[PDB]
């Protein structure tokens, strides 16, 4: 399920295996908008968690172009829980 709390300043992260996937649609095509996650999902151990799977994040998570157009960047913190 997605977390859907209001997102904040913290940037979402991705592990190497999930690197370049869109959290919402799991496509690897055209990353466009930086993923932003809520403070709770980025606190302590939770800090640095891969948005999709919770693994150590090696890169910034990116919502795809198709999702940005549909304003799916706006629904709230897309941390899978």
């Amino acid at each position: 399920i997605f977390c859907r709390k209001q997102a904040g300043v913290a940037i979402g992260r991705l592990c190497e295996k999930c690197d370049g996937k869109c959290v919402i649609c799991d496509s690897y095509v055209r990353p466009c908008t930086l993923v932003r996650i809520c403070d709770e999902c980025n606190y302590g151990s939770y800090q640095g968690r891969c948005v999709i799977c919770g693994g150590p994040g090696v890169s910034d998570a990116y919502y795809c172009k198709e999702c940005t157009i549909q304003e799916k960047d706006r629904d709230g913190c897309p941390k899978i829980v």
């Binding site: 209001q6 997102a7 300043v9 932003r36 304003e71 960047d73 706006r74």
Partner: peptide, 16 residues
């Protein structure tokens, strides 16, 4: 100096 408005922050909270 540049006669422009410069965007210092842009924080997102909803749909348009």
């Amino acid at each position: 100096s540049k006669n422009m408005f410069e965007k210092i922050h842009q924080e997102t909270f909803g749909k348009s």
